[PDB]
Amino acid sequence: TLTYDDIVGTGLANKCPTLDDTARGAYPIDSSQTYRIARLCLQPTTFLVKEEPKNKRQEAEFVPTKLVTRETTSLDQIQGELKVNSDGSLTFVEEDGIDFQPVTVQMAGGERIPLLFTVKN
Amino acid sequence: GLPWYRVHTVLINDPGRLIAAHLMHTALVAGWAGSMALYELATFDPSDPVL
Numbered sequence A: 001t002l003t004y005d006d007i008v009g010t011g012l013a014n015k016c017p018t019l020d021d022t023a024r025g026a027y028p029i030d031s032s033q034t035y036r037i038a039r040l041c042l043q044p045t046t047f048l049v050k051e052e053p054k055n056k057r058q059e060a061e062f063v064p065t066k067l068v069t070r071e072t073t074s075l076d077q078i079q080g081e082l083k084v085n086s087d088g089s090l091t092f093v094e095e096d097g098i099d100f101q102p103v104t105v106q107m108a109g110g111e112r113i114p115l116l117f118t119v120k121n
Numbered sequence B: 001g002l003p004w005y006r007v008h009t010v011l012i013n014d015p016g017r018l019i020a021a022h023l024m025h026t027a028l029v030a031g032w033a034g035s036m037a038l039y040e041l042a043t044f045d046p047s048d049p050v051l
């Protein structure tokens, strides 16, 4: 466990926690109890933007972009109910958290594309 | 004195100033190439090599 001072300025504050190769187990769901996601974190590694060509009949592709707003893109500290359904599916219902980031990326040639990268609600 | 259409004949017996005039010509042509390319880049739409 690193402290703030270990981390400040490294870029690690924008990275989600990882797990070891060894974590290939199974977390039991006991339909008797209630559950929560206490922390959800999402860390974008790629932003693609769909091109808008001059005619349909060309399937438009998603293309790579360049991030210009730095290491400010991650969603985190998100929490909420983890429901157990009749059919044993689970449903996450987001309640709160740092669940959005404005982001600007740039297309080849310079066009800037701001977006509100989010999982709100 | 020299007619207007002969002014550059001063260079015929002056190798150093001939080289200088050549260099200037060369500077003008290379500067043109540079300027031309920038104007083209400032106006070129790269978004459709098809049509």
Ligand code: CLA
Residues within 6 Å of the ligand: B002, B004, B006, B007, B008, B010, B011, B020, B021, B022, B024, B025, B028
């Ligand atoms: C490659 C081009 C070039 C070079 C290297 C030379 C070099 C020379 N000239 Mg020649 N000359 C040129 C082109 C050139 N000239 C042109 C186009 C004209 C017609 C205007 C002349 C008319 C001329 C005269 C009347 C004389 C020379 C003379 C000479 C010598 C002394 C320098 C001088 O007085 O220049 C004078 C010439 C200029 C300063 C050219 C004027 C600049 C023009 C109008 C372009 C403007 C440039 C500007 C930055 C861009 C405008 C953009 C636009 C959108 C408005 C030297 C051998 C002198 C001498 O040695 O005679 C024995 C002399 O009396 N030249």
Ligand code: CLA
Residues within 6 Å of the ligand: B004, B005, B006, B007, B008, B009
């Ligand atoms: C590499 C090519 C080249 C070179 C280095 C020369 C060099 C020379 N020429 Mg020749 N000439 C050429 C090609 C060339 N010429 C061509 C293609 C023609 C047919 C168009 C001629 C027809 C010609 C005549 C009829 C005469 C010369 C003369 C001369 C001498 C004096 C030039 C002068 O003072 O003009 C001074 C010129 C000005 C002050 C202004 C000229 C402005 C022009 C007309 C329009 C604007 C030009 C513009 C800047 C062009 C740049 C574009 C580029 C692509 C050409 C000099 C030795 C003279 C000579 O023999 O003296 C003894 C002479 O009477 N030339």
Ligand code: CLA
Residues within 6 Å of the ligand: B015, B018, B019, B022, B023, B026
């Ligand atoms: C090793 C011997 C040598 C070499 C390598 C050259 C090469 C050259 N000469 Mg020639 N020349 C020579 C011997 C040589 N010359 C001798 C012994 C004489 C009798 C004195 C001449 C008389 C002569 C005349 C009258 C002219 C040339 C010109 C040229 C140039 C024409 C192409 C140009 O401008 O491209 C474009 C240029 C480049 C792409 C840049 C190249 C990098 C440069 C050369 C580095 C500069 C540093 C260097 C230390 C300076 C001395 C260079 C000098 C050896 C050429 C070119 C650089 C013409 C000229 O210079 O036009 C502008 C020209 O008018 N020469």
Ligand code: CLA
Residues within 6 Å of the ligand: B008, B025, B028, B029, B032
């Ligand atoms: C192979 C390629 C080539 C060659 C052989 C030349 C040769 C010449 N150039 Mg250079 N030039 C070139 C490529 C070339 N150019 C390129 C790519 C550029 C960048 C645009 C230039 C830009 C340039 C400038 C700015 C100048 C030259 C000049 C010259 C002349 C210098 C020697 C002289 O005194 O002639 C004496 C002049 C003549 C014999 C008359 C040439 C007439 C041409 C061929 C026809 C154009 C005339 C027409 C009436 C002009 C209308 C233009 C108007 C609408 C604005 C010579 C004829 C200089 C010159 O003309 O100085 C007076 C000059 O100022 N050139």
Ligand SMILES: CC1=C(/C=C/C(C)=C/C=C/C(C)=C/C=C/C=C(C)/C=C/C=C(C)/C=C/C2=C(C)CCCC2(C)C)C(C)(C)CCC1
Residues within 6 Å of the ligand: B028, B029, B030, B031, B032, B035
């Ligand atoms: C000094 C210096 C520098 C800078 C430089 C520069 C910036 C330059 C520029 C240059 C340029 C920018 C140039 C330009 C040129 C141009 C030209 C030379 C043009 C010409 C034209 C003509 C000749 C035309 C003709 C005509 C007409 C007009 C019409 C139609 C017909 C015809 C085509 C005939 C640096 C920093 C690098 C460093 C070293 C020092």
Ligand SMILES: CC1=C(/C=C/C(C)=C/C=C/C(C)=C/C=C/C=C(C)/C=C/C=C(C)/C=C/C2=C(C)CCCC2(C)C)C(C)(C)CCC1
Residues within 6 Å of the ligand: B032, B035, B036, B037, B039
């Ligand atoms: C060493 C020194 C110095 C130096 C200086 C110099 C060397 C300068 C240069 C100068 C120069 C040498 C300049 C130039 C000019 C140029 C011009 C004036 C040009 C014009 C052009 C044009 C006008 C163009 C047009 C066009 C074309 C051609 C094509 C494309 C289109 C367009 C239209 C864009 C000083 C003093 C700083 C001081 C310190 C020391």
Ligand SMILES: CCCCCCCCCCCCO[C@@H]1O[C@H](CO)[C@@H](O[C@H]2O[C@H](CO)[C@@H](O)[C@H](O)[C@H]2O)[C@H](O)[C@H]1O
Residues within 6 Å of the ligand: A109, A110, A111, A112, B038, B039, B041, B042, B043
């Ligand atoms: C060495 C000498 C000094 C160097 C200066 C000369 C460089 C000139 C050419 C470089 C190419 C860039 O050229 C320039 O690009 C931008 C972005 O596409 C364009 O800019 C234009 O489109 C963009 C859309 O993305 C708008 O944000 C902008 O308000 C508009 O004017 C210009 O119309 C173009 O002229």
Ligand SMILES: CCCCCCCS[C@@H]1O[C@H](CO)[C@@H](O)[C@H](O)[C@H]1O
Residues within 6 Å of the ligand: A109, A110, A111, B041, B042
């Ligand atoms: C001599 C230095 C040249 C200065 C270079 C300008 C940046 S490069 C420039 O960038 C624009 C916007 O991204 C592009 O649209 C354009 O196509 C490209 O030429």
